């Protein structure tokens, strides 16, 4: 699988980076209450393949 998990980690990272964006305020945080799903998920994704952190 590796090539992927590897070539994933920067993106799967941007998620950790974006995950804490919060200086924030409004309806936009809805957008980010959108991501901590996906990027709590990609984790379970790789996790199927047994890739932990």
């Amino acid at each position: 699988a590796q090539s992927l998990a590897s070539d994933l980690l920067p993106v799967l990272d941007n998620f950790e980076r974006a995950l804490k964006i919060e200086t924030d305020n409004e309806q936009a945080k809805s957008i980010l209450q959108g991501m901590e799903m996906v990027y709590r998920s990609l984790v379970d994704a790789l996790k199927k393949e047994g890739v932990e952190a």
């Binding site: 309806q27 936009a28 809805s30 957008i31 209450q33 959108g34 799903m37 996906v38 998920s41």
Partner: protein, 509 residues
């Protein structure tokens, strides 16, 4: 002489099993999914069937969906003006089952056994059977699914006894009861409602959800088919999940949104909330079961045991809720969605396993050979062999520059030349002044049909063919063989023979 393929022809989707080895497996159809959905639609004048069918269903209004409800009745259906009959339809379905089973074996297949429900009749039966031949599958037999799914545990070889099969189909539900009398099935009662199934669960989940959503954030989801689907599926996966585990989380983020923007459907759900939330399917079920119970004159304790089928059947609450109103622990491990197809194939395997007769040919009851050099017996044809055959071997010069070679062709067992029976003794000359080494000689023993045995003796490079034929005359096969073999047993330490093997001594030239 093809195997006998078992098939389970269902309302919702149908499944196809075969046995090779002491082992019986479930053939998959060209796509994933060991189980194939039963349906068909036509577009090109070319049929499409199985899932690739459900896919384009909504293009061509011509899609035949569960037909198997219409077999055995006058019914016909119009396709772009032309009328068809169930058996013809279900037939083409079969043309697929058989087809791709052929794909899987590379071995064309015909003989087959196909299964139909307990409640079916003579008419209907000759309708499936009909369909089968129509597809080109000669039927070896047709038998009723629950019985067939009794061959999971194959109880015919057990105590005469009364047994319930509880089948929850994908989109159906049925129950059956059969006393197994004289080793077979007097199918004592049929029952159960024709709109039921997983999806009738997957649903309550879907409902609970959407209603909960409109509830808190105020929109009715059934409106956009997008998140409709997302929902459906979600709920389903949630179903399978709660098959074994005690909680789960669904997300469906980015599902839809209000004026504060994007709206994320999330949640965590229990086992129970669903158990109770499913509690209606739950208690509506059994009516057919009990009504059947008196319907045969039998008491709840009158059963021996209770099978299962119907892959949706693997459920917490179904199970929990059954055996308790019943006799012992529901029977397991047979993987329900195929359980039935499994049964098919079993009974098919059996249908091929008919012929037990026996016959003749002939074994050449005593092993033949030539005195070899050094004065030993060396078999050229092991004892029980066959209708005429041939063997060929070589051997070479005795000692330096042989001119001539005997062949003593003897019939027996024991290692030791003289220690057996003999037969014609011939020789070969014409051999040149070739030193001991590689002057090779091919000597064969032909055999032909009735016990006649030719023999050949030939040198290689000079091509000299002098040879005999035995008349099978002198050799005694009445007793004499069934004697002089046991001789070989009594005396088997005759391996002492190796003496002359050791006598390789005079090979010092």
């Amino acid at each position: 002489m093809s195997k006998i393929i078992g098939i389970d022809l269902g309302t919702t989707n149908s499944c196809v099993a075969v046995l090779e080895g002491g082992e019986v497996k479930v053939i998959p159809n060209p796509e994933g999914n060991r189980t194939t959905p039963s349906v068909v639609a036509f577009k090109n004048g070319e049929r499409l069937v199985g899932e690739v069918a459900k896919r384009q269903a909504i293009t061509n209004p011509n899609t035949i969906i569960s037909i198997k409800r219409h077999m055995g009745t006058d019914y016909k259906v119009e396709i772009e003006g032309k009328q068809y009959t169930p058996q013809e339809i279900s037939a083409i379905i079969l043309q697929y089952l058989k087809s791709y089973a052929e794909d899987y074996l590379g071995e064309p297949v015909t003989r087959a056994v196909i299964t139909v429900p307990a409640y079916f009749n003579d008419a209907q039966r000759q309708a499936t059977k009909d369909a089968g031949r129509i597809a080109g599958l000669e039927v070896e037999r047709i038998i009723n699914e629950p019985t067939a799914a009794a061959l999971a545990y194959g109880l015919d070889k057990e105590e005469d006894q009364t047994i319930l099969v509880y089948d929850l189909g994908g989109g159906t539900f049925d129950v059956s009861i059969l006393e197994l009398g004289d080793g077979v099935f007097e199918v004592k009662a049929t029952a159960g409602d024709n709109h039921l199934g997983g999806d009738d669960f997957d649903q309550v989940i879907i409902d609970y959800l959407v209603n909960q959503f409109k509830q808190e954030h105020g929109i009715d989801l059934s409106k956009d088919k997008m998140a409709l689907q997302r929902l459906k599926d979600a709920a389903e996966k949630a179903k399978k999940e709660l098959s074994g585990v005690t909680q789960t989380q669904i997300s469906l983020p980015f599902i839809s949104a209000n004026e504060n923007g994007p709206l994320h459907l999330e949640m965590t759900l229990t086992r129970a909330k669903f158990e109770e939330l499913s509690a209606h399917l739950v208690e509506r079920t059994m009516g057919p079961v009990r009504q059947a119970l008196q319907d045969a004159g039998l008491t709840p304790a009158d059963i021996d045991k209770v099978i299962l089928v119907g892959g949706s059947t693997r459920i917490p609450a179904v199970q929990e809720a059954i055996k308790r109103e019943l006799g012992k622990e529901p029977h397991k491990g047979v993987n329900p969605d195929e359980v039935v197809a499994i049964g098919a194939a079993i009974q098919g395997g059996v249908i091929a396993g008919e012929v037990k007769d026996v016959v003749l040919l002939d074994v050449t009851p005593l092993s033949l050979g030539i005195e070899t050099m050094g004065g030993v017996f060396t078999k050229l044809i092991e004892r029980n062999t066959t209708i005429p055959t041939s063997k060929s071997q070589v051997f070479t010069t005795a000692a330096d520059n042989q001119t001539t070679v005997d062949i003593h062709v003897l019939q027996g067992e024991r290692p030791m030349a003289a220690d057996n029976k003999s037969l014609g003794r011939f020789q070969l000359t014409g051999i040149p002044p070739a030193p001991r080494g590689v002057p090779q000689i091919e000597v064969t023993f032909d055999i032909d049909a009735n016990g006649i045995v030719h023999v050949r003796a030939k040198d290689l490079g000079t091509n000299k063919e002098q040879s005999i034929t035995i008349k099978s005359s002198s050799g005694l096969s009445e007793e004499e063989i069934q004697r002089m073999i046991k001789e070989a047993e009594e005396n088997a330490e005759a391996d002492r023979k190796r003496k002359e093997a050791a006598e390789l001594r005079n090979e010092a030239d």
